[PDB]
Amino acid sequence: GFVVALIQGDGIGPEVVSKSKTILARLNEKFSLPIEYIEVEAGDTTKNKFGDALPKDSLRVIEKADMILKGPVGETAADVVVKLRLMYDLYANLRPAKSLPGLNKFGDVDILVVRENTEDLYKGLEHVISDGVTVGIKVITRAASTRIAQVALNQALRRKKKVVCVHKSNVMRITDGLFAESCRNVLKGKVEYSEMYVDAAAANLVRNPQAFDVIVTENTYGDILSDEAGQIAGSLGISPSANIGDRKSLFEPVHGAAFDIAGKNIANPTAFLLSVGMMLDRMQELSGDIRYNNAAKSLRDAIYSVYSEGKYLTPDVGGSSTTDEMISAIRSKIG
Amino acid sequence: GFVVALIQGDGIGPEVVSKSKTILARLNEKFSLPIEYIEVEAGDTTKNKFGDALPKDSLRVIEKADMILKGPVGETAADVVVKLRLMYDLYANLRPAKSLPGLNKFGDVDILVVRENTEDLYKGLEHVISDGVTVGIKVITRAASTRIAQVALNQALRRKKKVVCVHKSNVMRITDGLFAESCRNVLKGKVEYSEMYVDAAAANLVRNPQAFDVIVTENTYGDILSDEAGQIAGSLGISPSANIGDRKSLFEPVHGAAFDIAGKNIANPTAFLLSVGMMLDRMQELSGDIRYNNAAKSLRDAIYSVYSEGKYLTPDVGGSSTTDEMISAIRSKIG
Amino acid sequence: GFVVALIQGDGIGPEVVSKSKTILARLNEKFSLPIEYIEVEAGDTTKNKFGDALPKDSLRVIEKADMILKGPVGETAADVVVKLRLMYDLYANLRPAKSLPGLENKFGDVDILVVRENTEDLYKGLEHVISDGVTVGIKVITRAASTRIAQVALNQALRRKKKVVCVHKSNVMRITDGLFAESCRNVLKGKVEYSEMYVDAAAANLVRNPQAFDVIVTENTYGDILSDEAGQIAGSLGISPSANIGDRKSLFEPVHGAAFDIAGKNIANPTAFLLSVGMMLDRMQELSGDIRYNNAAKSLRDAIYSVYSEGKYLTPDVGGSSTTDEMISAIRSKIG
Amino acid sequence: GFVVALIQGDGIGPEVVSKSKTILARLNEKFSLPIEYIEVEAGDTTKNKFGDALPKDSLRVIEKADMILKGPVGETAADVVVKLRLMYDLYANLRPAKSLPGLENKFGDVDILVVRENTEDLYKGLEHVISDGVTVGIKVITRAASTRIAQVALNQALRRKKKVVCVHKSNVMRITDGLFAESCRNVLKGKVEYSEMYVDAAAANLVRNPQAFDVIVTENTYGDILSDEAGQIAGSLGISPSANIGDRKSLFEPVHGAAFDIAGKNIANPTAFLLSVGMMLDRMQELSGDIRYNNAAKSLRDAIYSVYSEGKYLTPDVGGSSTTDEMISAIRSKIG
Numbered sequence A, B: 001g002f003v004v005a006l007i008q009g010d011g012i013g014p015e016v017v018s019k020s021k022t023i024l025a026r027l028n029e030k031f032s033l034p035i036e037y038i039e040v041e042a043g044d045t046t047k048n049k050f051g052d053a054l055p056k057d058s059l060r061v062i063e064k065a066d067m068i069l070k071g072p073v074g075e076t077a078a079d080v081v082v083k084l085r086l087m088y089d090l091y092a093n094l095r096p097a098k099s100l101p102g103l104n105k106f107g108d109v110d111i112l113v114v115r116e117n118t119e120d121l122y123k124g125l126e127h128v129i130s131d132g133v134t135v136g137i138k139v140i141t142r143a144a145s146t147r148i149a150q151v152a153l154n155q156a157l158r159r160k161k162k163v164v165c166v167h168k169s170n171v172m173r174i175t176d177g178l179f180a181e182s183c184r185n186v187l188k189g190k191v192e193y194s195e196m197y198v199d200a201a202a203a204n205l206v207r208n209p210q211a212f213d214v215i216v217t218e219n220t221y222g223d224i225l226s227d228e229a230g231q232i233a234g235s236l237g238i239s240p241s242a243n244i245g246d247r248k249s250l251f252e253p254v255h256g257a258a259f260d261i262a263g264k265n266i267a268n269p270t271a272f273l274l275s276v277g278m279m280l281d282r283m284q285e286l287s288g289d290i291r292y293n294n295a296a297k298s299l300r301d302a303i304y305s306v307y308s309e310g311k312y313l314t315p316d317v318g319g320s321s322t323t324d325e326m327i328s329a330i331r332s333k334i335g
Numbered sequence C, D: 001g002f003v004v005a006l007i008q009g010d011g012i013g014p015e016v017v018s019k020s021k022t023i024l025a026r027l028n029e030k031f032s033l034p035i036e037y038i039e040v041e042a043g044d045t046t047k048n049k050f051g052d053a054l055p056k057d058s059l060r061v062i063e064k065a066d067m068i069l070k071g072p073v074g075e076t077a078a079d080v081v082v083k084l085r086l087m088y089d090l091y092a093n094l095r096p097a098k099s100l101p102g103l104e105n106k107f108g109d110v111d112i113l114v115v116r117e118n119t120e121d122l123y124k125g126l127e128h129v130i131s132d133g134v135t136v137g138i139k140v141i142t143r144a145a146s147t148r149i150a151q152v153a154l155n156q157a158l159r160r161k162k163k164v165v166c167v168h169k170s171n172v173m174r175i176t177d178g179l180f181a182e183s184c185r186n187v188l189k190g191k192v193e194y195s196e197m198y199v200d201a202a203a204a205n206l207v208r209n210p211q212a213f214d215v216i217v218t219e220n221t222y223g224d225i226l227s228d229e230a231g232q233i234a235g236s237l238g239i240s241p242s243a244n245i246g247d248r249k250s251l252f253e254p255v256h257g258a259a260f261d262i263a264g265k266n267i268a269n270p271t272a273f274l275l276s277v278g279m280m281l282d283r284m285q286e287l288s289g290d291i292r293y294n295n296a297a298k299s300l301r302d303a304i305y306s307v308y309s310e311g312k313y314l315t316p317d318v319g320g321s322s323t324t325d326e327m328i329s330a331i332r333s334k335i336g
């Protein structure tokens, strides 16, 4: 079985996670899933109580858990999710941007961004050098570039066998140059391979998103391209994520805390529920138990039906229903 | 009068610049413009002849000139345009993304990106630290952040008095934090002001580009957002640029060398010609002579008519005509 | 008036500081000095009792104070001294290396002043692990800082033998050390007898002929090393003061450590602390403009030299058989 | 067999190197050493004639060579020596500071070896202007490099008095200097008599009691400074050799400069160059496995010590009245 650290987060995190809990419990029962969810404290409110956004007590629980499942965190998000990615070396950030039926703005969209998740500018090596002068250290390593490119190969083998490596090695000759070279060395000759500058990737996503299968890129570039790709697919409200390392993993929506709609019962739970889908997939592949696959298919079929029918969709995906209405619709289709 | 260093560049640069020359000469004559164009050597081919992509001889001419007007450069572009931005402190990169009539994909679009053009990761402070380990120094300074925010204020005063500062200060607390703080200090209270993380900017550009007036941001973020905004407006083939410093300025398309269509007479000259339009505007504001304004209006009216009529457009903007056909159409409407 | 945070510190720190108070009081009495000494806690003992080497209340008093006067700190010395240097931009570290009369010493009488940039170089702790087994540190050299320290070197040299050597390694560090050297040049050339020396050559040349040097101006790390070398050469390391001068704040301390070995035996030599009180009084003249701090510093320094010159009431480390207390009385008697 | 790029250099470099060739030949003859010496150009004179301090042809020969044997270089010393160090990862800098018989010297007989990490710290020149008046440099400390240098310190100490001091400033540079010290610990503890000393305390303690030290292991900058200090203390700076050891390549040179002052007068002391030939022969034993390089190095070193011991044919800098040429003949006669 699995122990899952469940972090609710801030803004819409609590309402989306707590309402979605009814579906997690229904899957546990219907498919006899040996998964224990333990709620753990992290984020902006947590920082007010403990003085730390990610306190020792929470770390103690997470260290014990197998996996982390979380809603968005607010202003302290770097002290929560970035700290976790670093400390557990959750080096592969997998973000599928996939259209659901009965949405546009771009028709059929299915793009996977594979984002390097541990280096680049994300380790906080920043300093005030002098009055009004600041510096940050960007870090690119062969080790980290090679392993992310390996993840991109594995993913692309399961899709259309096509990968574009996105970087800016024309300007960043040494750092991005090493990244591209490492990617080239793992990928070229095993999949259809190409390279594209990040600025031209941003434009090409808009011009022709159906030209893209797998995108492999660095931390900050992946942050940016995954948001763009997510919106293109139709909404950040439908965009899930897996942060996968060697020993642990973390599952979460791409979207933020959305403080301006918090408490209003219109947040889309789909990104979170799809992240649960990716969690269950991995539970299957680790356990060798088909029940997690059955629960994953029930979940996804349910969401896909709700979208296909199109009566209980939140405003962000073109509907007029509440988070509650959406959750009940999905729940009744399970399972 | 003005002396203009004219750099043709690589890929489609030569054909677009040399064909456009007929319009530059026609404006000089029709409006009695005292502008001398001097052709100077820069880029990939230039590097083969001299050993330097931007040789001393070219620098000698540029130092003498008032302004630089250029086509795209290929693989050595960082040794050409980045070297020029740095050495002349051309600190404001102004990129208007504006729809022309009779294009979509997004209807009416009019967004100005104001991109800081001298620091961030663009100064090439990169090193191999150790076997397989590389580092780059990102630089953000108050001085540079303040002056770009001043340019964004001036531009926004001429438009809808609305500015969004785009950064990633949730993760880059010190560098991006200083950037945002400097922007806040110049802008807030003088224009409608807000702040947005770069990832959410990328998504919001797609979701609702008409919500944006002026975007002020750092070097790399601006590189990325200006390409996305340009495509949204309809094509990188229509996206001009001004690089403005205290003593000199440089005008150029946002797009690259486009080697795969070089020599095929289908490149869109509009981005370059619109960059000439921005050059002439500035000549007016420096000289106090209305003739440059008359030439600028003739040029823009001509291009706008060609687009509005819609018979002589290149493939990138939905037509089927050649670069030649487009140039002759614009030329005959001048002036 | 001035307020002075008086830090007793660790090891011999408390005995030296507290036994010297009677000299502080004498000076205030004889020269009508409006100085208030407020006791502030810092160091290893403070950390054990309060949980911090510099607890909140200590920082509170330090803020209000104009100057800090301290004894040695133990294992938390870096935590205390460095934080204070950076917090209050105490940019000039003044390290005199001067023989006293007539002490046994291998090199004869040496008189050298190291002027050490005290806020940048590698002391800002801008360090990280960037990868498994790879660390990096950021050395910072600025024009403003290098210019400031050279101006200080100018004033000290003019007061001495008009001779400054700028010490660096700009043959290898072309940009950082090159900016330091250039800033020293621009301040010093044409106003003093100026020269430059590579740091490795300086270390050899101090040994070879220490009598050739007057003032050395250099960076944070090079200065840490050359101060101690010059100090040992002069035979004065256990005896010599130091000053860390900032615009709004200054810190004065002996260069010697806590010497836990001899704590409690009533023999610690108070000379270094007392000369650092001498440097404090010099800085009080400058900020206040008044002559009484000068007369006081000269009285103090005269008294000290005379007890070393007569030989009858010295502690054992400088060739005597008296207690700290007996040495202090003798010094105290010669004041006013 | 070995190929040695023989660099004559500048100032006294050419006279010392070329007059020593007859000793190179003697050694090859007497001990059947398959060594080929190929003359390679580098330095100030080379730059003036060819446009580069290390021209293409020089780099071509250096590549093919197993070892570099050089005299001093002038103003281009950093351009030459540093490039070579980084290019060929000559990671161990061996700097002996040893008195010779029986030279006048202030501190008596000293025998100290500095083992200096020779490829990282601040010597990679990772420096820039980041803003008007603000420069930055990147100090790099790696586990691999620090471990390598400690292993070298182990072998040298075992050959000597089994005593190593690791010198650093980890109280201030907690991460870079902390990794260096930790790597030295992990190699050395339990195999030698190990201790650590702060770099400023080391500079003072070398002066105070140089007889206490056997081997010092430290970083690139600290080593540059302490080598020269220790060298002056021993009275051996003009006399002492150095080695820069890499896996595929090694460089041997005197520590003394070009001494343009005395070039052409037939008096330059060839001892430093000749002992660096001694260190070259030690390294040739290790790579080849054969004993003849050892017998040769001992013959050389015996010959040198004996001419210093008899006093009749020494150059003027070490208290004699002979020419370089006369000193070389005397040395040459005692070989084989």
Ligand SMILES: CC(C)[C@H](C(=O)O)[C@@H](O)C(=O)O
Pocket (backbone or CB within 6 Å): A077, A078, A081, A082, A223, A254, B170, B171, B199
């Ligand atoms: C909230 C923020 C720290 C995070 C990131 O920057 O990675 C978010 O934007 C994401 O994409 O997961």
Ligand SMILES: CC(C)[C@H](C(=O)O)[C@@H](O)C(=O)O
Pocket (backbone or CB within 6 Å): A170, A171, A199, B077, B078, B081, B082, B223, B254
């Ligand atoms: C060609 C490249 C150096 C340049 C940049 O990165 O700025 C280009 O992408 C641009 O946007 O002007």
Ligand SMILES: CC(C)[C@H](C(=O)O)[C@@H](O)C(=O)O
Pocket (backbone or CB within 6 Å): C077, C078, C081, C082, C224, D171, D172, D200
């Ligand atoms: C204790 C240490 C941090 C301090 C320094 O490095 O300056 C000391 O060595 C000194 O010389 O004041």
Ligand SMILES: CC(C)[C@H](C(=O)O)[C@@H](O)C(=O)O
Pocket (backbone or CB within 6 Å): C171, C172, C200, D077, D078, D081, D082, D224
């Ligand atoms: C000349 C210089 C680059 C070199 C060094 O700094 O190591 C020299 O001082 C030395 O000790 O070999």
Ligand SMILES: [Mg+2]
Pocket (backbone or CB within 6 Å): A223, A224, A227, A254, B199
């Ligand atoms: Mg994001």
Ligand SMILES: [Mg+2]
Pocket (backbone or CB within 6 Å): A199, B223, B224, B227, B254
């Ligand atoms: Mg671009």
Ligand SMILES: [Mg+2]
Pocket (backbone or CB within 6 Å): C224, C225, C228, D200
């Ligand atoms: Mg010190």
Ligand SMILES: [Mg+2]
Pocket (backbone or CB within 6 Å): C200, D224, D225, D228
């Ligand atoms: Mg040296």
